[PDB]
Design a protein around this ligand. Structure first.
Ligand SMILES: *[C@@H]1O[C@H](CO[C@@H]2O[C@@H](C)[C@@H](O)[C@@H](O)[C@@H]2O)[C@@H](O[C@@H]2O[C@H](CO)[C@@H](O[C@@H]3O[C@H](CO)[C@@H](O)[C@H](O)[C@@H]3O)[C@H](O)[C@H]2NC(C)=O)[C@H](O)[C@H]1NC(C)=O
Ligand SMILES: *[C@@H]1O[C@H](CO)[C@@H](O[C@@H]2O[C@H](CO)[C@@H](O)[C@H](O)[C@H]2NC(C)=O)[C@H](O)[C@H]1NC(C)=O
Ligand SMILES: [Ca+2]
Ligand SMILES: [Ca+2]
Ligand SMILES: [Ca+2]
Ligand SMILES: [Ca+2]
Lengths: 328, 482
């Protein structure tokens, strides 16, 4: 196979997200410099992506969609003016601002992640400021409210939700991983009794990790550790801790996103200085190997979009044009 | 003037034991890493504040910590300045600590406001981070020392705002996307600080750096006779004078306030006028291209008439202290307000707090007690307000005060030490003491009861600055010369 170039959208982007609303596939694009949260819609007639709707916010970083019982909610992380929560109205056909995240608890957001634990919906906001604490919110039917703060006085860059097996258990339990500046990645474990994440442990061997993203092959659980300079790493989870698999040189990298397309496991390592490298999983090698080579200016994210047996690859650009790829 | 000049911060860096461990117990790595931090902070300062950050000294605690580093940056800052007082003997305009640890505060560092040129306040502390990040940390730490504080009164009012929506500004909360610019409001505060008589030690231009000589850096290093700046800005000044860091055929100098078309400015030419009544004017030596080192009157000289007394080139008055905390529109209360409220020793006026109970001020130590202002607001320019604002009422005088806490120990809202409380009397720990209690040094004088033989002014370097046609270290010798 190959990732062929579909189209190049004439604007910059930071974070790209996808979701399913009323059996249609949408794509949310966060525009840092303009302010818009750009929603894309699929045209089944012209086989292209239209412009569904926008959400205006002065310095958006993340636009995370949450779908609770067919109702669409969007978390808008802003560096200016504070973060807000929007709700899509089916009747008025618009987005409504229904909730405000206080500007003092969350000041410099950098990543938003969503997860579901025993029929409860949550989301976590990584705050890269010291005064701003990484906070978990909980869905209580009408809106989201503070549930737990983590990593005080830490410059948290990314959050990642994990479901991992702790030896000698046999069932996957919820986990969170926090990446902070000049610091080791932290693994939080979910405690059902207290209904909050505790028992934190550092990931040794990793200094200055920017972000963490996980994938699963053969039932085993892996993660991709990203550095800007130095070497990115791939690790396997084995009961109690993560183990070394391989490593790759990171030349100004901001992304190391694992993707699973058509039961094929891919891994796209972005680069600001050079060409973005796509990796494929090797069954014999139990390792990632060189696959295809992309060319995008300062990639910030890679997201997989599946529509009717058609697989698309969205690549965000911080200085250049955001690119859409076709997987054939 | 004083704000159009290029300022120079002679900085010393101290690397603690944890900073040394972060660089794998390597001396050469700690130095280059710290230099990188300083250089990037320099590029920030050079562009906006017209000030250079120059590394003049550095030491690294390779063996162990000299004292216990606290998670509280304010606690750490003080113990560091004590170490600085007793163990550091190299000269610098400011001494900053590079800690490999991380603070458990909202700030990535701490530094005394208006602290530069001082021995106890001339410093700050900075936590470890990425090179670009720590540079910002140093910039905002040195900003405090340099007098730059984000005016909360103007912030809340919307009078001062950061126009950068994405990266924000230096004195604001720092996140992943780092700031690059000071606000225009910050610039004004810095200028106000210099015009107030602050930053006197910032006008000596460093020559030999801690790095290999570089022609086109704007610094006269080893081997080179001069150094204009950059080929772009050398055109403005020094182009005709300096060629490839070498003086031309007909040139005594290249650039500077005392340099005119590659020639020295004659002795007696004013190169820097006094910013206030605490300052001493500087004249060109005639033998140097740079203006003479910025000096001022010693501590003890009066200012604002008899209402104030000079300290560190700055005038300490109750009126200015009120303006410093609550705003320029705010003025000090009448002496009658003090003469009644302070004596009571109530919450509405006192000479300090002793175990849940206020101290009732003595009748002489009334001007050294609870600070009283007029036309006060509800938000201080700096620090945190602890409690509520005191407001007390033929003329009826509105006495207002307030408790502002920078430190758990330091409380703004009481009369600052050194503030005049009468003829030849000042405040010391909420007590009115004579001038002899402060143990001021004195210049040489050959006439009894006069300073510098009644023909000169005693500088802060404890030297006599003689008047016109007077010479000698005691300014007693008369010298006639048109
Ligand atoms: C919470 O996480 C700990 C991991 O260790 C924790 O992290 C460090 C950063 C520190 O904070 C430590 O103080 C802290 O304990 C889990 O500890 C692990 O528990 C398991 C059993 O639950 C232990 O298994 C045993 O390990 C011995 C080792 O020789 C084996 O031979 C045995 O067969 C047995 O399986 C494991 O050793 C222990 N790990 C460590 C490093 O102590 C802890 O279980 C976890 N708590 C919960 C509720 O999940
Ligand atoms: C949503 O945002 C997009 C921005 O990508 C808008 O597209 C812009 O439309 C304006 C005209 O209104 C043009 O001037 C711009 O050049 C367009 N931008 C790009 C990148 O092509 C789109 O119109 C917005 N939609 C709504 C409903 O506001
Ligand atoms: Ca994340
Ligand atoms: Ca100096
Ligand atoms: Ca030079
Ligand atoms: Ca002077």
């Amino acid at each position: 196979t190959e990732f062929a170039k579909s189209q190049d959208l004439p604007y910059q982007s930071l974070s790209i997200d996808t979701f399913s609303y009323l059996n249609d596939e949408y794509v949310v694009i966060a525009q840092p410099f303009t302010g818009k949260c750009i929603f894309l819609e699929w045209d089944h007639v012209e086989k292209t992506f239209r412009n569904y709707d926008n959400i205006t916010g002065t310095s958006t970083v993340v636009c995370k969609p949450i779908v609770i019982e067919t109702q669409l909610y969007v978390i808008v992380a802003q560096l200016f003016g504070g973060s807000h929560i929007y709700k899509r109205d089916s009747f008025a056909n618009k987005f409504i601002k229904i909730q405000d995240i206080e500007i003092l608890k969350i000041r410099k957001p950098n990543d938003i992640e969503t997860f579901k634990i025993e029929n409860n919906w949550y989301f976590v906001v990584a705050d890269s400021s010291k005064a701003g604490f990484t906070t978990i919110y909980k869905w209580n039917g009408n809106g989201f409210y503070s549930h737990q703060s983590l990593h005080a006085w830490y410059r948290d860059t990314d959050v990642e939700y994990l479901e991992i097996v702790r030896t000698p258990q046999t069932l996957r339990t919820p986990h969170l991983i926090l990446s902070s500046s000049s610091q080791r990645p932290v693994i939080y474990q979910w405690n059902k009794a207290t209904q909050l994440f505790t028992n934190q442990t550092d990931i040794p061997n990793m200094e200055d990790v920017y972000a963490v993203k996980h994938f699963s092959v053969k039932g085993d659980v892996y993660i991709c550790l990203t550095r800007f300079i130095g070497d990115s790493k791939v690790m396997k989870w084995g009961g109690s801790s993560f183990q070394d698999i391989q490593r790759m040189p990171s030349r100004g990298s901001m992304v190391f996103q694992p993707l699973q397309i058509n039961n094929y496991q891919y891994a796209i390592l972005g680069s600001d200085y050079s060409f973005t490298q796509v990796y494929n999983w090797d069954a014999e090698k139990a390792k990632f190997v060189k696959f295809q080579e992309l060319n995008v200016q300062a990639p910030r994210s890679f997201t997989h979009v599946s529509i009717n047996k058609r697989n698309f690859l969205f690549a965000s650009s911080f200085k250049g044009n955001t690119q859409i790829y076709k997987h054939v | 003037n004083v704000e159009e000049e290029t300022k120079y911060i002679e900085l010393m860096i101290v690397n603690d034991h944890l900073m040394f461990k972060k660089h794998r117990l390597s001396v050469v790595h700690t130095n280059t890493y710290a230099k990188s931090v300083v250089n990037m902070a320099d590029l920030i300062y050079k562009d906006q504040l017209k000030t250079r950050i120059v590394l003049v000294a550095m030491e690294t605690w390779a063996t162990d910590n000299k004292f216990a580093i606290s998670e509280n940056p304010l606690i750490t800052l003080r113990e560091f300045m004590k170490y600085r007082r007793d163990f550091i003997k190299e000269k610098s305009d400011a001494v900053h600590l590079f800690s490999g640890s991380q603070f458990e505060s909202s700030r990535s560092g701490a530094a005394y406001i208006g602290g530069i040129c001082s021995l106890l306040k001339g410093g700050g502390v900075n936590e470890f981070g990425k090179t670009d990040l720590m540079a910002v940390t140093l910039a905002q730490s040195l900003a405090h020392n340099i007098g730059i504080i984000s005016d909360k009164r103007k912030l809340a009012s919307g009078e001062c705002k950061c126009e950068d929506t994405w990266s924000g500004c230096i004195m604001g909360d720092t996140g992943y996307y780092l700031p690059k610019k000071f606000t225009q409001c910050n610039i004004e505060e810095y200028h106000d600080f210099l015009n107030s008589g602050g930053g006197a030690c910032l006008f000596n231009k460093p020559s030999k750096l801690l790095d290999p000589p570089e022609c086109g850096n704007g610094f006269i290093e080893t081997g080179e006779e001069c150094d204009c700046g950059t080929p772009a800005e050398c055109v403005l000044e020094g182009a005709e004078c300096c060629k490839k860091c070498t003086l031309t055929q007909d040139s005594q100098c290249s650039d500077g306030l005392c340099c005119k078309k590659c020639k020295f400015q004659p002795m007696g030419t004013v190169c820097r006028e006094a910013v206030n009544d605490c300052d001493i004017r500087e004249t060109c030596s005639g033998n140097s291209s740079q203006c003479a080192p910025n000096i001022h009157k010693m501590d003890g000289y009066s200012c604002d008439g008899v209402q104030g007394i000079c300290f560190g080139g700055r005038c300490k008055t109750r009126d200015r202290q009120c303006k410093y905390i609550w705003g320029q529109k705010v003025t000090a209360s009448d002496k009658y307000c003090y003469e009644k409220l302070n004596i009571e020793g109530t919450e509405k006026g006192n000479c300090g707090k002793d175990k849940d109970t206020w101290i009732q001020c003595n009748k002489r130590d009334v001007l050294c007690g609870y600070l009283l202002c007029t036309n006060i607001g509800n938000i201080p320019r700096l620090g945190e307000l602890d409690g509520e604002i005191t407001s007390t009422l033929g003329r009826t005088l509105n006495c207002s005060g307030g408790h502002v806490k920078l430190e758990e120990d330091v409380d703004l809202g009481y009369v600052e030490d050194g503030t005049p409380c009468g003829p030849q009397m000042m405040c010391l720990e909420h007590r009115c003491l004579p001038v002899a209690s402060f143990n001021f040094s004195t210049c040489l004088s050959s006439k009894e009861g006069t300073i510098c033989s009644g023909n000169g002014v005693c500088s802060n370097e404890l030297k006599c600055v003689c008047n016109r046609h007077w010479i000698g270290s005691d300014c007693n010798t008369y010298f006639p010369h048109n």
